[PDB]
Amino acid sequence: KPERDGLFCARIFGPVKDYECLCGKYKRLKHRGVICEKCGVEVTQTKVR
Amino acid sequence: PPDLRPLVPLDGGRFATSDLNDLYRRVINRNNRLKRLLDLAAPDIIVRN
Amino acid sequence: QNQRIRIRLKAFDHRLIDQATAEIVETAKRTGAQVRGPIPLPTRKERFTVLISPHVNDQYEIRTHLRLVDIVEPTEKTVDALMRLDLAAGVDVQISLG
Amino acid sequence: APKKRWYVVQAFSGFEGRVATSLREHIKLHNMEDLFGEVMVPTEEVVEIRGGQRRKSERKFFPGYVLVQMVMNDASWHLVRSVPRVMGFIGGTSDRPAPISDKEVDAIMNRLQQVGDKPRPKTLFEPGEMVRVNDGPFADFNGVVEEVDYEKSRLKVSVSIFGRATPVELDFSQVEKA
Amino acid sequence: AMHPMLNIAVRAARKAGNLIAKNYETPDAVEASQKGSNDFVTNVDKAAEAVIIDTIRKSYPQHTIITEESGELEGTDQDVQWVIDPLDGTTNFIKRLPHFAVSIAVRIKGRTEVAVVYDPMRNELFTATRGQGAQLNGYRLRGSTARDLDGTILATGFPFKAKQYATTYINIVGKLFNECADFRRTGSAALDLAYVAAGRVDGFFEIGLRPWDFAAGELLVREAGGIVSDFTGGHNYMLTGNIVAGNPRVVKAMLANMRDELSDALK
Amino acid sequence: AARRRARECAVQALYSWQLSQNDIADVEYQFLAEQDVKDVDVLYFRELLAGVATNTAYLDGLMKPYLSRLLEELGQVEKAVLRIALYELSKRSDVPYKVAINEAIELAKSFGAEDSHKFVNGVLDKAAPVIRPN
Ligand SMILES: [Mg+2]
Ligand SMILES: [Zn+2]
């Protein structure tokens, strides 16, 4: 998994998997756009990385 | 961005560490070290070097 | 597990202090927790003052009661019922674990 | 009356200790203790009882360098450059190094008194960060540290018990991340 | 996780906002108490300020605090400053207009480190921390996507306390109105900055702002992809109370547009 | 300090006893475990632990028609304090009315509910008959 505050930190760049939070709190296209609160990463398409 | 400097793995835990990642590791390491010295009473010649 | 689950309880009310203490020691003696004594340390004077729109230019010292109860047996259901069973407001519930 | 000043030489990544050793050894070799006072490698001993590293941990004031009480002379210069693994004389122009100031020595030694006096566990805590609890009484709960204490070391931490948030006096030994 | 100081600040802001909202439904108790030239300071401002300061003192009895009312309360550790506006746009509150916010920012070594603004009415919480970005109730904030002056919405405040520059300001206003789309005038520089961070306004500018008002927004827009500057691109704004901010291209266009009309007093 | 005040050194125990409802021996056990009290003669500690004998009821039975209010409504602090003060003279016979009642009034000020002394003194006039050779 990409390490927080690292050269691949999902929080700083984006989710590794499309529309899937890093901590697994969301896996649905509906919830697109809300950052998580357990790992703190926006939920979008992976393209943003 | 993390995409354009990817860290592609191999059949095992062998990752193609692209030079960009390594240079970034080096420079960020120097930066962290130098900051930690700056707060820690900063011996002048040492912070200079 | 660890012993000193020791709850001190300040307040200015009395009867609800008794209610909360009785309920707490109930949970203790019911969940297998070896309760120690409530041991109400001497009631203390505590200074107030009217910090509102005053009289144009009203308790100021109160007998705050203190129940210093201790529980030394933290089973699972102990913490379960504790965080479950609630307490009235108007009580200072600074607890210690150790 | 040659007063040996204090100079600094660059060590390598993970070599500092054996570098200081070899330095003293070569001093004894040329018997030049009169020219080389003391080779100083300041360090720190951060002590945590659990959390992976346990009961101790060894930090340094600053890596890659070594502090010496040498006296300036070309002989001593090559005597330090004729050692296994060092860089040049950290300082001004090479072959004419810059001794560090006496105030530097005094401040660094006050630092050493401070660190060696109190074993101070770093990776410290800040009032306002959230953190879980790995301890039996409050396993895997999570609240916010409302006050950090060091001597008592008992983490005044507000957590949710019986609805109303309340402080708790759990010790460092059971804290989670941060 | 989360930034600690940010967390304690947002707790303070929640408490303060709840107090303000609770008092908002009894206009017979909060009176108009003016301080300067139409800068009211009602008692509710004092109460919210005291609440915030109390909540802070629990976790930092040593941090020096700054407030428009109590000036500067020194602390035993004055390397870190807490700038507060318990209420922004006092006028909007006295008219009971439901658009205002409390602003709390924390500077470290002079550079602003964290900031929060809280509107209780709409219940919106703009948080921002350097090195992590800006959030609006969980959404990232990348400001307006504008790259010109057409179709752009410009939020602004008027120097209704430094009316000497009025003409000057109005002058530039006219110039701006020849290129922009529409204006916005809400009455709370903190909330306007916040909107800039949310892209709800394509930019913002103002003259005569106290140093304890943009400190909670300048970091907001900065970590929101936008930028701030004085009316000339420098950084004397922290002293001139003259701010212009927005996404970079719009800021460039606005500066190149304003530099001529500008009265050399502000330069 | 030691002899008389001994009572209020361990009324806590009583309180805790009347709240814990466990073995009085273990009650005094945990109490002495709580702190090392030196203002109490250990003989009076043994008296306080002896204050469990069933005449407790009887001494409130002593005033059972001589009550201004109910019994459970009298707080656990007042319950314990009055019960041991009457255990002095209803089963133990330590001192006369004036002495023991001056005790029961002075050594409940750091525990009473800001008015306890008025009612305990008004109802304790039953302490006059219980030792009529005053
Ligand atoms: Mg204000
Ligand atoms: Zn997550």
Curated annotation (Swiss-Prot), chain E:
GO biological process: inositol metabolic process; phosphatidylinositol phosphate biosynthetic process; ribosome biogenesis; signal transduction; transcription antitermination
Catalytic activities: a myo-inositol phosphate + H2O = myo-inositol + phosphate; 1D-myo-inositol 1-phosphate + H2O = myo-inositol + phosphate; 1D-myo-inositol 3-phosphate + H2O = myo-inositol + phosphate
Summary of activators and inhibitors of this protein: Inhibited by Li(+). Li(+) binds to Asp-85, Asp-88 and Asp-213.
Main location (coarse class): cytoplasm
Upregulation: Transcription is autoregulated. Repressed by the Nus factor complex (NusA, NusB, NusE (rpsJ), NusG and SuhB).
Named cofactor requirement(s): Mg(2+)
Binding site for Mg(2+): E68, D85, L87
Protein's UniProt name: Nus factor SuhB
Organism for this UniProt entry: Escherichia coli (strain K12)
